Design a protein around this ligand. Structure first.
Ligand code: THP
Ligand code: CA
Length: 129
């Protein structure tokens, strides 16, 4: 997989963010995770965590997997990095997202993220509390 440039347009919630990618505004949905909706428990904390991560970053990159790059809503499907740290993995490691939506052929970082979930769960963090 390859990291590609993007710039932040706007934080949305725990697992979607609006980025400019190849010069075009797009909403990205983070691969392999599910944060609570803003209206749900930990939803505001997830939104806050992603917002802080992407807004503080000097460099945002989007990494597509091997499969579908857009979902049925037209959202980009990618792993998003902030100054080299994967947002997807960070949310899971903090107990603010569950590993989820693991579809065949867009699942390169599956085992990485499950390892993070196990550790958040061992720690009883947030969702696992
Ligand atoms: C993460 C992801 C979501 N989706 C679709 C599945 C779900 O369809 P449904 O809308 O029919 O439930 C939806 C969940 O995204 P959200 O968690 O943002 O609501 O997005 C994909 O198709 N591929 C993906 O990789
Ligand atoms: Ca969600």
């Amino acid at each position: 997989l390859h990291k590609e440039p993007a710039t932040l347009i706007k934080a949305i919630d725990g697992d979607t963010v609006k980025l400019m990618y190849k010069g075009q505004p797009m909403t990205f949905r983070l691969l392999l995770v599910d944060t609570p909706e803003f209206n749900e428990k930990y939803g505001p904390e997830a939104s806050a965590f992603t917002k802080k991560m992407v807004e503080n970053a000097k460099k945002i990159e989007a990494e597509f997997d091997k499969g579908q790059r857009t979902d049925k809503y037209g959202r980009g499907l990618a792993y998003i990095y902030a100054d080299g740290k994967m947002v997807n993995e960070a949310l899971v490691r903090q107990g603010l997202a569950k590993v989820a939506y693991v579809y065949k052929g867009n699942n390169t970082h599956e085992q990485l993220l499950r390892k993070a979930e196990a550790q958040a769960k061992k720690e009883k963090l947030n969702i696992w509390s």
